[PDB]
Structure 1
Amino acid sequence: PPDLRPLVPLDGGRFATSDLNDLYRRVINRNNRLKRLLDLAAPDIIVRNEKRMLQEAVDALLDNGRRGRAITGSNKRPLKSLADMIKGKQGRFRQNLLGKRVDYSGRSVITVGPYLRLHQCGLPKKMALELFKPFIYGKLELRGLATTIKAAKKMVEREEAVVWDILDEVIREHPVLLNRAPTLHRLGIQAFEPVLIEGKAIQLHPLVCAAYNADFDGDQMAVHVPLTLEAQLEARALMMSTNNILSPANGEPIIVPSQDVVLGLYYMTRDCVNAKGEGMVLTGPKEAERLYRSGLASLHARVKVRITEYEKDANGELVAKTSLKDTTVGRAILWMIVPKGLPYSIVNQALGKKAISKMLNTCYRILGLKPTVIFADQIMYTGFAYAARSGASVGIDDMVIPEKKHEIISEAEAEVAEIQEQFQSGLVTAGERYNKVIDIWAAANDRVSKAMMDNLQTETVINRDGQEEKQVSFNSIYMMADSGARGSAAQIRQLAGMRGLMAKPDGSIIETPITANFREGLNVLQYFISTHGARKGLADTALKTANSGYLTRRLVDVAQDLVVTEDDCGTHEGIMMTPVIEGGDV
Structure 2
Amino acid sequence: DIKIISNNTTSINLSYITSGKNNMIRSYIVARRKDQTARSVIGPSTSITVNEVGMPAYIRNTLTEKIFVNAFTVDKVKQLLASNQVKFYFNKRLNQLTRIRQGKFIKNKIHLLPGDWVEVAVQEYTSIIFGRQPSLHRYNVIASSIRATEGDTIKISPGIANSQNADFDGDEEWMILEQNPKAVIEQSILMYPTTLLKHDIHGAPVYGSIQDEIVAAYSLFRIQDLCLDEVLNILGKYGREFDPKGKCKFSGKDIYTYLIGEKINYPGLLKDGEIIANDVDSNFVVAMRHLSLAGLLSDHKSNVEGINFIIKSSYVFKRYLSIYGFGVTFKDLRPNSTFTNKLEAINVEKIELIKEAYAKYLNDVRDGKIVPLSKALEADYVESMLSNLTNLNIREIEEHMRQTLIDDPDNNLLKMAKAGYKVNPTELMYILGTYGQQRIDGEPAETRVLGRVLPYYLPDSKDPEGRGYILNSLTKGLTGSQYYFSMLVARSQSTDIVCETSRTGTLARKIIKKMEDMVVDGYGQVVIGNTLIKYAANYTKILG
TM-score by length of 1: 0.69
Q: Would the alpha carbon gap of residues 64 and 329 (structure 1) be closer, same or farther in structure 2, given more than 3 Å must change?
A: farther
Cα distance in structure 2, aligned partners of 1:432 and 1:149? 81
Deviation at 1:516, TM superposition (A): 1.8
SS at match of 1:109: strand
Distance 1:481 1:368 in 2: 33
Cross-structure match for 2:267: none
Cα deviation for residue 98 of structure 1 reads: 0.8
Q: Which amino acid aligns with 1:475?
A: N
Structure 1 stretch displaced more, 442-451 or 196-205? 442-451
For structure 1, which segment, 141-150 or 170-179, has the greater mean C-alpha deviation from structure 2 after superposition? Answer: 141-150
- Residues 1:264 and 1:568: Cα distance change in structure 2 (over 3 Å): closer
Query: Aligned pair 1:392/2:337, yes or no?
Result: no
Q: Is the 8 A contact 2:125 2:145 kept in 1?
A: yes
- SS across alignment from 1:419: helix
How far residue 215 of structure 1 moved from its aligned partner, in angstroms, is 1.8
Identity %: 18
- After superposition, the C-alpha distances for 1:1-26 in whole angstroms (9 at most, x for unaligned) are xxxxxxxxxxxxxxxxxxxxxxxxxx
Find the partner of 2:509 among 543, 549, 553: 553
Deviation of the 1:495 alpha carbon:
2.8
Which residue of structure 2 lines up, in the alignment, with residue 346 of structure 1?
Answer: 275
Distance 1:437 1:116 in 2: 58
Matches for 1:88-107 after TM superposition, within 5 Å: 88-107=20-39
Distance 2:38 2:68 in 1: 17
How far the C-alpha of 1:370 sits from its partner, in A, is 1.4
**Using a 3 Å threshold, how does the CA distance of structure 1 residues 385 and 519 change in structure 2: closer, same or farther?**
farther
Q: Deviations over 1:456-475 (max 9, x none)?
A: 232345xxxxxxxx58x432
Q: Are 1:227 and 2:227 counterparts? A: no
Please say if residues 141 and 147 of structure 1, whose CA atoms lie closer than 8 Å, have aligned partners that are also in contact: no
2:491 corresponds in structure 1 to 535
Deviations 1:365-396 (A, max 9, x none): 22321121111011112222323444322332
Contact map agreement 1:178 1:223 (CA 8 A) in 2: yes
Instruction: Note closer, same or farther for the CA distance 1:497–1:91 as it changes in structure 2 (3 Å cut).
Output: same
Letter in 1 for 2:135: T
**Gaps in structure 1 of 5+ consecutive residues:** 1-62, 72-77, 157-165, 272-277, 295-306, 310-321, 462-469, 579-586
Shift of 1:502: 0.6
- Deviation, structure 1 residue 436: 2.5
Q: Distance in 1 between matches of 2:256 and 2:120?
A: 35
**TM-score of the two chains, using structure 2 as the length reference:** 0.74
Q: Which residue of 2 aligns with 1:190?
A: 142
Task: Find out whether 1:337 has 2:259 as its counterpart.
Answer: yes
Q: CA deviation at 1:267?
A: 2.6
Contact map agreement 1:394 1:476 (CA 8 A) in 2: yes
Q: Conserved in 2, the CA contact under 8 Å of 1:177 and 1:189?
A: yes
Residue 119 (structure 1) aligned to one of 51, 62, 67:
51
Of 78-87 and 186-195, deviating more is 78-87
**Whole-angstrom distance in 2 between the partners of 1:453 and 1:126:** 54
Aligned to 2:284: 355
Corresponding position: 1:177 with 2:90? no
Say if 1:443 and 1:518 are closer, same or farther in 2 by CA, change over 3 A: same
CA displacement, residues 193-237 of structure 1 (integer Å, 9 cap, x when unaligned): 010112110001111120001121111111111212222221121
Mapped partners of 2:325, 2:229: distance in 1: 24
Answer whether contact 1:136 1:170 (CA < 8 A) is retained.
no
Kindly indicate whether residue 445 of structure 2 is the aligned counterpart of residue 500 of structure 1: no
What corresponds to 1:376 in structure 2?
310
**Structure 2 vs 1, CA of residues 476 and 237 (structure 1 numbering), >3 Å: closer, same or farther?**
same
Q: Which moved more, 1:477-486 or 1:213-222?
A: 477-486
| Cα distance in 2 between the residues matched to 1:507 and 1:110 | 40
1:417–1:486 CA distance, 2 compared to 1 (3 A): closer
Q: Please tell me whether residue 509 in structure 1 is matched to residue 444 in structure 2.
A: yes
**Equivalent position of 2:368 in the other structure:** none
Check conservation: 1:141, 1:152, Cα contact below 8 A: no
Q: Helix, strand or coil for the counterpart of 1:425?
A: helix
Q: What corresponds to 2:102 in structure 1? A: 154
Q: CA deviation at 1:97?
A: 0.7
- The 1:477/1:508 distance shift into structure 2, 3 A limit, reads same
User: Does residue 1:69 correspond to 2:7, yes or no?
Assistant: yes
Q: What secondary structure is seen at the aligned counterpart in 2 of 1:107?
A: strand
Q: Which deviates further from its counterpart, 449-458 or 528-537? A: 449-458
**1:323 positional shift:** 10
The reply to whether residue 211 of structure 1 matches residue 163 of structure 2 is: yes
**Equivalent runs, 1:378-457 vs 2, <5 Å:** 378-400=312-334, 401-402=339-340, 404-427=342-365, 429=373, 431-457=376-402
Distance of aligned partners of 1:216 and 1:488 in 2 relative to their CA distance in 1, 3 Å threshold: farther
Distance change >3 Å, CA 568–CA 94, structure 1 → 2: closer
Q: Distance in 2 between matches of 1:347 and 1:208?
A: 29
Cα pair 1:263 1:479 within 8 Å, conserved: yes
The residue correspondences of 1:278-293 to structure 2 (distance < 5 A) are: 286-290=228-232
Q: Secondary structure at the match of 1:289?
A: helix
Query: Offset at 1:555?
Result: 0.7
Mapped contact 2:257–2:274 kept (Cα < 8 A): no
Aligned residue for 1:226, secondary structure, equals coil
TM superposition shift of 1:561: 2.3
2:215 & 2:514 partners in 1: Cα distance? Answer: 43
Structure 1 residues 337, 226: closer, same or farther in 2, change over 3 A? farther
Code of the aligned partner of 1:171: Q
CA–CA separation in structure 2 for the residues paired with 1:536 and 1:325: 61
Amino acid at match of 1:102: K
SS of 1:178's partner is strand
Q: Distance in 1 between matches of 2:516 and 2:234?
A: 57
C-alpha separation between the residues in 2 aligned to 1:135 and 1:155? 22
When residues 308 and 348 of structure 1 are mapped into structure 2, their CA distance, relative to the original with a 3 A threshold, is: farther
Which deviations, in whole Å up to 9, do the C-alpha atoms of 1:240-275 show, x marking residues without a partner? 11111122232222124322321221232345xxxx
Query: Against the structure 1 CA distance between its residues 211 and 489, is the aligned structure 2 distance closer, same or farther, given a 3 Å change threshold?
Result: farther
> Residues 569 and 453 from structure 1, CA distance in 2 versus in 1: closer, same or farther, beyond 3 angstroms?
closer
Q: For residue 413 of structure 1, what is the amino acid of its counterpart?
A: I
Distance across 2 between alignment mates of 1:436 and 1:308:
67
Question: How far apart, in 2, do the equivalents of 1:292 and 1:213 lie?
Answer: 30
Higher CA-based Rg: 1
Q: Using the alignment, how far apart are the partners of 1:385 and 1:348 within structure 2?
A: 24
Equivalent position amino acid for 1:235 in 2: Q
Structure 2 unaligned regions, length at least 5: 89-98, 105-117, 237-241, 265-271, 366-371, 446-463, 527-531, 540-544
- Alignment of 1:478 with 2:407, yes or no, is no
